[PDB]
Design a protein around this ligand. Structure first.
Ligand SMILES: *[B]([O])([O])[C]([C][C]([C])[C])[N]C(=O)[C]([C]C1=[C][C]=[C][C]=[C]1)[N]C(=O)C1=[C]N=[C][C]=N1
Ligand SMILES: *[B]([O])([O])[C]([C][C]([C])[C])[N]C(=O)[C]([C]C1=[C][C]=[C][C]=[C]1)[N]C(=O)C1=[C]N=[C][C]=N1
Ligand SMILES: *[B]([O])([O])[C]([C][C]([C])[C])[N]C(=O)[C]([C]C1=[C][C]=[C][C]=[C]1)[N]C(=O)C1=[C]N=[C][C]=N1
Ligand SMILES: *[B]([O])([O])[C]([C][C]([C])[C])[N]C(=O)[C]([C]C1=[C][C]=[C][C]=[C]1)[N]C(=O)C1=[C]N=[C][C]=N1
Ligand SMILES: [Cl-]
Ligand SMILES: [Cl-]
Ligand SMILES: [Mg+2]
Ligand SMILES: [Mg+2]
Ligand SMILES: [Mg+2]
Ligand SMILES: [Mg+2]
Lengths: 195, 212, 204, 222, 196, 233, 222, 195, 196
């Protein structure tokens, strides 16, 4: 798919992901949720080749849910991100690699810290304060470089995210039909229904 | 390359970077990507160094010949169209140019034209051209207003290039500033990014991802 | 397209008098797009230091692999691995992927704990050992690094002099490379103390 | 790379240069291109560096185990056969071009192996980018019934031809001499044309020249 | 490469040049292309040196093991082992081989095995890049039941011309004589054969 | 753009104390076929210059005619054609070098490598190279094709730099050239035993030797070489 | 297919002083792994106190230099023996190069001399005519090895003043001709070590108000 | 450029043309007028390769204006469309053809009839009640097939045109930044400033 | 194609096969590849039939016009006109021509012009695809100053072998004799030359 953004503020991680699904000349859907909850305090957004994106996300989801049941314990975002990276790093040298780029937004309940990880289809992991995949970063990183702070509130994070989406809506050629925004914090995961 | 130009209350702001590359090799950090066509016209340079240099200094010769024959300053529209018509003749041959022809006349006021080696000629208020154009657009679009002071507009243009110099690998070196008014253009110095970055970071409180 | 120059980055290592130094930039990018300025490329397993340039996913993978191997080595041998031995382990491990290699440019640096002798070594992506006396370079600005090291370097430098030489080699080489820079780290290594310094450099 | 092999009346001598290159860049100014397969069997290698090192050690390992199994000194034809059959297996993808030499209970031997697995026999041989310079010298000065001293000179003269005239060859001259009845003598940097020349200047920096942001002590201990 | 094998009254003689080339560079000017797979069964090799060596080595192994179990093999049997390797691996090989041997029952026999892996029993055979230039000469001058001296002259003259015109051929002319008397090796240098 | 058909291999040359020597075999190859065995590839221009040409023979014959025409044209309205205004090696070279680069710039090259060897009016030795690309260079020793790889190393052992030229005699130089020609016959698959050699001396003038042969060849050691490794018989 | 271009190796270096300028270049000429000449001059005196070098494909380099020298000659004829200023020569060369924009001179051109105020000047060109006045510029094969060294040792980049720790830069003091020649020699000695196409000899042309002077130094021949 | 539409109603011709100019990854302008007045009662919209579009349109414009002055007379839309077709038909077999597709909307003052001509870069002319170039027709012709009448008013034509633009904004992947609408009738050419 | 021209005591003889092929189909089995550009200057044609005909026609025109102005041309002159066309148009031609003629002053002369457009004056020359197989035979059997009957036998035997081995060659063996006596045409059929 197209645009997926992530921003880590003081006490939460915010993921924004486009709603459009365009197969060639037609926009088939304008309300697609490009994300999966891996665990109560860990969310993963994704974008890449059709089919592979969802197949990969649900495969990861299942594995983390299996771990959670076996140990009666939630893995740290760092641990989940490392598991995901390894799967992609294994995948890139497969017969047919997963063509999927992901952002992993999680709240570590042990450290009481939000954490954002950006991983591409090669298995290239980086922890960031804010991240993006595809052409999104080309427009949005300049704004985030200017406006971002580590001590921002969730509301300020959302306002800065609106400024990113506005810039994308102005300068990007493709109509991505807005974004679904989700917040990950100590209380879990919730969706901002008005954006 | 990152170059920008935008119209506002106090005329035009033009800001460019200084980097030139050959693959991953940084060939130069001191390139003049602004050409002073005359006391009222400026041209920005992006793409092929030789193509832009050669044809923009040639453009100056045509503009001079115009005002000799017509006893009148050439319009920004006419000057830009001389360049676009020229590159259009060479279309397909492989010229690589992304330019902004910026100036001020009585009949037009402050004017900017985007001229392209594909033959594209566009009039507008804001333009960013080059490999780092997207980075510059982010800062510009979120802070632009018609009612900006020459001082604030100059800083915005300088800051928008800095944004691009940081993120774009093929942009950087230093920032050249120009301010175009009713009485002509005015150079506003060369600003090394190696000093400007740390200065802006400290004073502005931005770039919190980098450590310093 | 070229895997060794997608992410970008550099590593350099130098020997001095009873000391070694290893340094790296902090950039990780997706071609023209800069992504991270905290991507360190130097790791250590006990007192042996390993710098790795090239494709970032492999940099990460090999680090995790050599941590894995040096940890088992230690449990069985009941001692930490030495630079000379680790160098052979890196070569072995790379060559086993001869026809499906890791796209990397590793650099080993350290001091032998028994002899006290300083040691550096470089490799190509498939295991060939370059065991130089003077210096080792790696990455997208290796040509630049070769020129800087070959002109700046002199033998038997003291730790605090070696720091200046290697830092200036890296910095000026990175500033002539579009895909290197965005910060830098220098490790100064002595027989029983190691100092890590982050350098101030231009952020473009 | 210039590597050479010359037979003499009571043994055989091997030689090589010491340059390694990535394109036009020099990677190592003192690469050791002479390898030990067994104590009295050495080979010189050109082509892909990792392949020459790896294939030389693998066969060296198997030769050692074979020697122990048979309770005998290893032969040069055994190394030759093991090497070529391995290189052939990989249809030239293992870029090892070798000159194999040694003494064994059968006498003294000199051979060459190409990456595809073809072997040759001769009294004098050369491989590498500088092989043509070297062979021109060998074809001009070789005669049969050489002494140990004449053969070493002929070999090192051949290696010099490559050093000067071939851009892929430079620096020092390594030699190894395998004589019948004697121990093999490995002559690392047998010839060093004299050196680098002192540099007009010293570029040692004033301490504090480099700007620093942070410092910390690293915990290497357990 | 210029190789040939010729049957005559007392047996068979194999002949070959000694040039190995990498493009226009002569990598070896004293090559031995006449190789032994059994006491009185030899072959002439043309094409890839690596392929023809590997094949010959495998054949020698097969005939050595044959001999240990069933006694001395026929020349026809040797040719069949060559054929089996060349035919079944025709996609990956570049080998043009002439097999020649001496039995007491069958006397001198010559089998040629070109690129495809086919077998052809002949009175004499020529192969290699330089063979093209002597098809006319060899056809006109060959006779059956020649003497040893006549056959040596025939091979010497034929390969002399092949060498003269083919750049891939040269050096010395090697020959191997196979008779009841035993195995004799011959060599002829440039100064001898060039003036013919 | 073309491809060479009938070709000539190495041309080798070197300076010595009183002049220059140049040599080239008499073969005209047609791919792997050694087709023509009586081809003169050294072409004298006057009594002070010899042009040695390798590569495409049809282009060589064209150049041969240009040079012949150059002599004719120089004589026109020139009372000093056999004296002060005679053709110099430097004139002949520069002309060829102009033509070669012009032809490469039209993407229709003369597929050759040329060495102009001669002695100037002031007695100075002239030796310079030019090829199909119009690339030019001068050196105490010059060789084309395989000669560059095999002959130069041998000739450079005699004259390694400019200061070795006055110390090198014509006998030593000719000896080195003749040895190099033997080595090329051992190792170049497109060489012939027969060759021509030319000496241009500032005292004795132009000496053009034809029908030379490679002699004193070592082949006897071939008898001892058996098999390709393990074979003993 | 016919390739009208070639690579003759070599490396050149121009440094502008306060009242002088130098243009240096090695004297080695190559194709692939072979040496054509150990002494083939590459930097030329073009008259009017201007020196020039067109490094890369020697045929195009010689052609360009030849044409520019010719341009100087005709500039005298057409403009009453007026001296061609270094800035005027630079612009003239841009037009020579760009005239072949669609079939370029495959060379990196540098010229050096003095400007009309008597100060040292160096101009650098790309193959298709883009140019810029510089204080320092290396060109050719080993340019990537040399330029960083010159950024550090001529413009004092990344160098600061001890004690201040990154706050105050090393001041940009002017260099003498003796100091410049040391940097040039060390640059070419370093380049010779790590680049195979660089060696044999170094020839430097120094330009002052008094005229054009030459200096020659040997380099390694391997 | 991207989307150009045309519709001929009872007494007028309406041309709608997108405002976006996208050069690669960025939308450089969102107010571009992809049309030229050839004569007082003849308007030509255009879309195709960059540079060629404007160069061609202005070349045609100049030629028609020259004719108008010479004869003191306005050419019929049919005559102008035939001239334009011939230029393109000449162009397609040139060294470098004009890569331009046009719609010519004109009001014939002699016949008192609106006329819409669709001409592609090959010089393929057709007179139509409604037309489009590029991928626009794929979405819009079905709507026009359903809703169109020859006796529609200009206001009804605009409402039907809004329905076309709405469908394009829903299903097309590219954000074409709305359209500039122009009406051609007996009184000349005018622009609808609110659409 | 198998063509050859041979000088002898009384003059020169040209010889050729008569096969024209389109792939493996013999489009013409009775072709005349011996063509006349002047009374006693003929040529042998190999390569493209269209190209070699066009060339020969142009040459005949040039020599006819030469004769009208300057009298009978030399064989060398004829070869030069062939060369000029073949050399200057080398990119667009596929022609391998042998020029042979008889003067009273110069007697029998033979010039060969291969693909490149180079000229080579020889005692005898062979060309065409089938020439490859008779380099050895022709080199061994050629003598200078042969008789007419000896030269006819030499050409007949040589082309017989060339035909035997080359699939592109065949049919009849045509010959043209050029002497002071005049011009004589000869033909030799398969039944005659195959049994040689
Ligand atoms: B900029 O990147 O467009 C820049 C502008 C120019 C006026 C210096 N161009 C270059 O850096 C180009 C390469 C390039 C990089 C990225 C996008 C487009 C083009 N370099 C050159 O033209 C050049 C000129 N001389 C020497 C080396 N490189
Ligand atoms: B010599 O040219 O044969 C030499 C032999 C010696 C070094 C073992 N070979 C090399 O130096 C090779 C050249 C080469 C480059 C690229 C592909 C294949 C071969 N060098 C290396 O293998 C090499 C060594 N270290 C780092 C990188 N490459
Ligand atoms: B002969 O030319 O066919 C010869 C016979 C071989 C058994 C020594 N072959 C070669 O010389 C081949 C190349 C070749 C030439 C002509 C036809 C077919 C093949 N050479 C090699 O196999 C070779 C060359 N250099 C190194 C190793 N092997
Ligand atoms: B001979 O084979 O060269 C022959 C000589 C020609 C003068 C009659 N040429 C041909 O037969 C050619 C094909 C060819 C075969 C072998 C080598 C080169 C060319 N044939 C034709 O030109 C031809 C075939 N069919 C119809 C018309 N022309
Ligand atoms: Cl062999
Ligand atoms: Cl015909
Ligand atoms: Mg940058
Ligand atoms: Mg060398
Ligand atoms: Mg249509
Ligand atoms: Mg037939």
């Amino acid at each position: 798919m197209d645009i997926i953004l992530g921003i880590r503020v003081q006490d939460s991680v915010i993921l924004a992901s486009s709603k459009a699904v365009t197969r060639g000349i037609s926009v088939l859907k304008d309300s697609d949720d490009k994300t999966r909850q891996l665990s109560p305090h860990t969310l993963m957004s994704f974008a890449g080749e059709a089919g592979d994106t969802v197949q990969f996300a649900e495969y990861i989801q299942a594995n983390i849910q299996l771990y959670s049941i076996r140990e009666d314990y939630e893995l740290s975002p760092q641990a989940v991100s490392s598991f995901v990276r390894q799967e992609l790093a294994k995948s890139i040298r497969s017969r047919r690699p997963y063509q999927v780029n992901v952002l992993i937004g999680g709240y570590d309940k042990k450290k009481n810290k939000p954490e954002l990880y950006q991983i591409d289809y090669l298995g290239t992991k980086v922890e960031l304060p804010y991240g993006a995949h595809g052409y999104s970063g080309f427009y949005t990183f300049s704004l985030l470089d200017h406006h971002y702070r580590p001590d921002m509130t969730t509301e300020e994070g959302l306002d800065l995210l609106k400024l990113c989406v506005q810039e994308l809506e102005k300068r990007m050629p493709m109509d991505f039909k807005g974004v679904i925004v989700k917040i990950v914090d100590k209380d879990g995961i919730r969706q901002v229904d008005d954006f | 390359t990152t170059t920008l130009a935008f119209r506002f209350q106090g005329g035009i702001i033009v800001a460019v970077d200084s980097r030139a590359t050959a693959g991953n090799w940084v060939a130069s950090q001191t390139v003049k990507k602004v050409i002073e066509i005359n006391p009222f016209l400026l041209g920005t340079m992006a793409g092929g160094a030789a193509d832009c240099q050669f044809w923009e200094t040639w453009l100056g010769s045509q503009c001079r010949l115009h005002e000799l024959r017509e006893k009148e300053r050439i319009s920004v529209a006419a000057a830009s169209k001389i360049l676009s018509n020229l590159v259009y003749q060479y279309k397909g041959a492989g010229l690589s140019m992304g330019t902004m022809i910026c100036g001020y006349t009585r009949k037009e006021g402050p004017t900017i034209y985007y001229v392209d080696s594909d033959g594209t000629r566009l009039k507008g208020d804001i333009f960013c051209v080059g490999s780092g154009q997207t980075f510059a657009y982010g800062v510009l679009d979120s802070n632009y207003k018609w009612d900006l002071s020459v001082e604030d507009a100059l800083y915005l243009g300088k800051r928008s290039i800095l944004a691009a110099a940081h993120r774009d690998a093929y942009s950087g070196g230093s920032v050249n500033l120009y301010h175009v008014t009713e009485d002509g253009w005015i150079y506003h110095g060369n600003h090394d990014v190696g000093e400007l970055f740390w200065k802006v970071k400290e004073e502005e409180g931005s770039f919190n991802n980098v450590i310093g | 397209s070229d895997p060794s120059s997608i992410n970008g980055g550099i590593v350099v290592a130098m020997t001095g008098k009873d000391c070694v130094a290893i340094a790296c930039d902090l950039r990780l990018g997706s071609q023209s797009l800069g992504v991270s300025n905290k991507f360190e490329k130097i790791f250590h397993y006990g007192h042996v230091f390993l710098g790795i340039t090239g494709l970032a996913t492999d940099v990460t993978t090999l680090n995790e692999m050599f941590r894995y191997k040096t940890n088992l080595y230690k449990l069985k041998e009941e001692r930490a691995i030495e630079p000379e031995t680790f160098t052979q382990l890196v070569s072995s491990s790379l060559y086993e992927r001869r026809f499906g290699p890791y796209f990397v440019g590793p650099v080993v640096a350290g001091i032998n704990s028994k002899s006290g002798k300083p040691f550096i070594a470089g490799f190509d992506l498939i295991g060939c050992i370059d065991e130089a006396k003077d210096f080792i370079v790696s990455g997208t600005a290796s040509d630049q690094l070769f020129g800087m090291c070959e002109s700046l370097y002199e033998p038997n430098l003291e730790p605090e002099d070696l720091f200046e030489t290697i830092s200036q080699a890296l910095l000026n080489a990175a500033d002539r490379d579009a895909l290197s820079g965005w910060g830098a780290v220098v490790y100064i290594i002595k027989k029983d103390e190691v100092v890590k310094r982050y350098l101030k450099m231009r952020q473009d | 790379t210039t590597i050479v092999g010359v037979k003499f009346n009571n043994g055989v001598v091997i030689a090589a240069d010491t340059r390694s290159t990535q394109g036009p860049i020099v990677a190592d100014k003192n690469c050791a291109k002479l390898h030990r397969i067994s104590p009295k069997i050495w080979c010189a290698g050109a082509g892909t560096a990792a392949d020459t090192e790896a294939v030389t050690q693998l066969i060296g390992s198997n030769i050692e185990l074979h020697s122990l199994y048979t309770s005998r000194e290893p032969r040069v034809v055994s190394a030759l056969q093991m090497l070529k059959q391995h290189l052939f297996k990989y249809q030239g993808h293992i870029g090892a071009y070798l000159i194999v030499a040694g003494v064994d209970p059968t006498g003294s031997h000199l051979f060459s192996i190409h990456a595809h697995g073809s072997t040759d026999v001769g009294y004098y041989l050369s491989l590498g980018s500088g092989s043509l310079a070297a062979m021109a010298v060998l074809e001009s000065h070789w005669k049969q019934d050489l002494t140990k001293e004449e053969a070493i000179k002929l070999a090192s003269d051949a290696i010099q031809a490559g050093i000067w005239n071939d851009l892929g060859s430079a620096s020092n001259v390594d030699v190894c001499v395998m004589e019948i009845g004697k121990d093999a003598e490995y002559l690392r940097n047998y010839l060093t044309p004299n050196v680098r020349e002192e540099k007009q200047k010293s570029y040692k920096f004033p301490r504090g020249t480099t700007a620093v942001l942070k410092e910390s002590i690293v915990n290497i201990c357990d | 490469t210029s190789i040939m094998a010729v049957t005559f009254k007392d047996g068979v003689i194999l002949g070959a040049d000694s040039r190995t080339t990498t493009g226009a560079y002569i990598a070896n000017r004293v090559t031995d292309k006449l190789t032994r797979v059994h006491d009185k069964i030899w072959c002439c090799r043309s094409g890839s040196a690596a392929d023809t060596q590997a094949i010959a080595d495998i054949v020698q192994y097969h005939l050595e093991l044959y001999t240990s179990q069933y006694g001395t093999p026929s020349t026809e049997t040797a040719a069949s082992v060559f054929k089996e390797l060349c035919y079944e691996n025709k996609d990956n090989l570049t080998a043009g081989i002439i097999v020649a041997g001496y039995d007491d029952k069958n006397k001198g026999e010559v089998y040629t095995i070109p690129l495809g892996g086919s077998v052809h029993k002949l009175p004499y055979a020529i192969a290699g890049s330089g063979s093209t230039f002597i098809y006319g000469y060899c056809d006109k001058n060959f006779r059956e039941n020649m003497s040893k001296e006549e056959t040596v002259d025939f091979i010497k003259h034929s390969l002399s011309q092949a060498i003269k015109w083919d750049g891939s051929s040269g050096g010395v002319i090697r020959m191997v004589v196979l008779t009841a008397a035993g195995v004799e090796r011959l060599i002829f240098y440039p100064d001898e054969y060039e003036q013919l | 753009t073309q491809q060479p058909i009938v070709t000539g291999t190495s041309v080798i040359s070197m300076k010595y104390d009183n002049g220059v020597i140049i040599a080239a075999d008499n073969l005209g190859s047609y791919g792997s076929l050694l087709r023509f065995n009586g081809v003169e590839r050294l072409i004298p221009v006057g009594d002070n210059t010899v042009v040695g040409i390798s590569g495409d023979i049809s282009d060589m014959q064209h150049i041969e005619r240009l040079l012949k025409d150059l002599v004719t044209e120089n004589a026109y309205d020139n009372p000093l054609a056999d004296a002060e205004e005679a053709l110099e090696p430097s004139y002949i070279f520069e002309y060829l070098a102009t033509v070669m680069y012009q032809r490469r710039s039209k993407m229709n090259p003369l597929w050759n490598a040329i060495i102009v060897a001669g002695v100037q009016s002031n007695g100075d030795q002239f030796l310079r190279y030019v090829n199909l690309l119009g690339v030019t260079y001068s050196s105490p020793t010059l060789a084309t094709g395989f000669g560059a790889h095999m002959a130069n190393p041998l000739l450079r052992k005699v004259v390694d730099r400019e200061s070795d030229i006055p110390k090198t005699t014509v006998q030593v130089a000719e000896e080195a050239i003749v040895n190099a020609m033997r080595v090329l016959y051992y190792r170049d698959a497109r060489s012939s035993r027969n060759f021509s050699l030319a000496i241009i001396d500032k005292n004795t003038g132009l000496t053009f030797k034809k029908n030379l042969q490679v002699e004193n060849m070592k082949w006897d050691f071939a008898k001892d070489i058996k098999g390709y490794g393990t074979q003993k018989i | 297919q016919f390739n009208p271009y070639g690579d003759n190796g070599g490396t050149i270096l121009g440094i502008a002083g306060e009242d002088f300028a130098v243009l240096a270049g090695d004297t080695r000429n190559i194709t692939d792994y072979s040496i054509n000449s150990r002494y083939e001059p590459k930097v030329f005196d073009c008259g009017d106190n201007i020196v020039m070098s067109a490094n890369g494909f020697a045929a195009d380099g010689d052609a360009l230099v030849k044409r520019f020298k010719n341009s100087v000659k005709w500039y005298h004829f057409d403009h009453n023996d007026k001296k061609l200023s270094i800035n005027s020569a630079a612009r003239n060369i841009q037009h020579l190069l760009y005239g072949k924009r669609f079939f370029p001179y495959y060379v990196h051109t540098i010229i050096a001399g003095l400007d009309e105020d008597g100060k040292g000047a160096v101009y650098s060109f790309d193959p298709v005519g883009s140019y810029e006045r510089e204080q320092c510029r290396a060109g050719g094969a080993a340019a990537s090895l040399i330029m960083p060294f010159l950024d550090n040792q001529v413009n004092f980049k990344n160098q600061y003043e001890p004690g201040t720790n990154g706050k105050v830069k090393k001041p940009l003091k002017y260099l003498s001709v003796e100091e410049v020649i040391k940097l040039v020699r060390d640059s070419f000695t370093s380049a010779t070590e790590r680049h195979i196409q660089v060696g044999d000899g170094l020839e430097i042309l120094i330009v002052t108000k008094d005229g054009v002077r030459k200096e020659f130094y040997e380099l390694k021949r391997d």
